[PDB]
């Protein structure tokens, strides 16, 4: 499964809104999509952020919905929004879709401060 | 020494990721591999893009790792990735390997816009 990322990278600033989108290049394989991010550090694992579908956005435990959310824009377009960028928001953002029990990952989007 | 290219060709779009792979079909001949490009026009010469190996990717001087990179992914498989396709990324991509002072070249992979 292929995705197009809009934008493909972002240099942001503290306090700024950041809006990311991933677009599935094929439809009908899933109704939902997850956003994840990898935080630079010694832990190589990604961090689950949210699951987006026809239902309300489901945020990862402990996340502030005032700060981070997302939306299913269409059957193939998914959006993530950071309302006011914080230092800890820096990382590599990507989408994941499960289809036929296979985890697929979009390309990653580096979102960093100067 | 022969190469297998995956894919053999690609029609891309602006802002899409492009991932190419070339696999050496004979083991034990080289542990490194170069990606080159040919663009018809004013300079027919093979243009060096990167040398992949056990070491970090060695990009040609002037290339931006935020746009172009690659990786050695097995003993024989080598990959080139464009993060966001640009008009200027169009052309014929191919791999080259040296073994016992003998230069080898893969088939050309056309990567173009509609």
Domain range for residue B102? 1-114
- The coordinates were experimentally obtained by X-ray
B14 touches chain A (CB under 8 A): no
Question: Which CA distances in Å does B10 have to A27, A108, B69, B77?
Answer: 20, 21, 18, 18
Interface test with B, best of A107, A111, A112, A114 (most B CBs within 10 A): A107
The three-state DSSP-derived secondary structure of B18-47 is EEEEEEECCCCCCCCEEEEEECCCCCCCCE
The alpha carbon dihedral of B34, A104, B4, B18 has a sign of: negative
To the nearest whole angstrom, how far is the Cα of B1 from the nearest Cα of chain A? 32
**B85: nearest Cα among B35, B14, B19:** B14
We report the CATH number of the domain holding residue B14 as: 2.60.40.10
Helix (H) or strand (E) holding A34: strand A33-38
Phi, psi dihedral angles at A18 (to 5 degrees): -125, 125
Q: Which residues does chain A have within 8 Å of residue B16's beta carbon, measured at their own beta carbons?
A: 4
Q: What is the CA angle A23-A39-A18, rounded to 5?
A: 50
**Cα(A21)–Cα(A68) distance, integer angstroms:** 14
Q: How many domains does chain A have?
A: 1
């Amino acid at each position: 499964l292929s995705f197009r990322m809009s934008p493909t990278q972002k240099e942001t600033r503290l306090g700024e809104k950041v809006e990311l989108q991933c677009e599935l290049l094929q439809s009908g394989m899933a109704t939902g999509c997850s956003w994840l991010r990898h935080i630079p550090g010694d832990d190589p694992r990604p961090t689950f952020l949210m699951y987006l579908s026809a239902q309300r956005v489901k945020l990862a435990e402990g996340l502030d919905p005032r700060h981070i959310s997302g939306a299913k824009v269409s059957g193939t377009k998914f959006q993530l929004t950071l309302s006011s960028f914080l230092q800890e928001d820096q990382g590599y953002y990507f989408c994941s879709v499960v289809s036929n029990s296979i985890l697929y990952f979009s390309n990653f989007v580096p979102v960093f401060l100067p």
